[PDB]
DNA sequence: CGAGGTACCTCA
DNA sequence: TGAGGTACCTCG
């Protein structure tokens, strides 16, 4: 029933995996599903296209990315098992560990997607969803 | 019935004649009476404070400056008796060239400030009044 | 110039 | 965050 806003591009590469971490500067004793929600801020095109770049690099020439990434929605959700420190992050995820340099790193795993992704306004940090929209993404998850 | 518009506070001071030269980056043959219209542009009242010091420094403790300085309208008139280049204009006026560092330098004299002032908007450097416009100016001027 | 779309900034 | 006022930018 807990939300965290993201902007996108990176809301969306989360959901589908290819992002794995998200740097906050603060701290969550939160663990286990963790939705996100897309902000209204709208990426540029060149936004899109640089950072797809970067992580077919990072991750392999045939990486799939969403066809779109779209603003102000819940768009799925992650299994957060683990906030760690920068630390911490350096010495757990060696390889990975250049993707934050956050002093705090959401370590994200068990991506969904869901396929009707439904408007919503954002709070800063976690923020709890309404019942509502809640039921309705569970059923989305299918 | 040639006009060049001007930034408040600057516009006022010039039909009052606490300004006495104009600046620009371009030259004009024009002679005799050139009306002044304020730009659209308000200023702040930190930078007529800011410069009603200035003058105040450069003309008198008790200059008279106006209550107000009125955007998008036609203020008066001065008679261009020069356009100097900032060579001319350090040569001939050597007490107030430090007022001016511009390329070319509008000298005035017997500013006239309309009692009442009438929206207008303006064009680039320096352009024609339309016809009515001038004959209520010219009958503001009695 | 004047106009207005866009980017930036602040929020009992 | 999302909202909106303000400042900045460009213009057959």
Redesign the pocket.
């Known amino acids: 029933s807990w939300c965290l ?1 993201v ?1 996108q591009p990176w809301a969306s590469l989360l959901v589908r995996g290819i992002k794995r971490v998200e740097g906050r500067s603060w701290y969550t004793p939160h663990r286990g599903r963790l939705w996100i ?5 709208k990426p ?1 095109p060149q936004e899109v296209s640089e950072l797809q770049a970067t992580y077919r690099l990072l991750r392999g020439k045939d990486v799939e990315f969403p066809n779109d990434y779209p ?2 929605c819940l768009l799925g959700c992650v299994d957060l098992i683990d906030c760690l420190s920068q630390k911490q992050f350096k010495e757990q995820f060696p390889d990975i560990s250049q993707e934050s340099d956050s002093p705090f790193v959401f370590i994200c795993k068990n991506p969904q997607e869901m396929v009707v992704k439904f408007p ?5 940090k976690i923020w709890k969803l309404d019942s509502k929209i809640h039921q309705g993404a569970k059923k989305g998850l299918m």
């Open positions: 806003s902007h929600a897309a902000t209204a801020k540029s603003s102000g919503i306004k954002g709070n800063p």
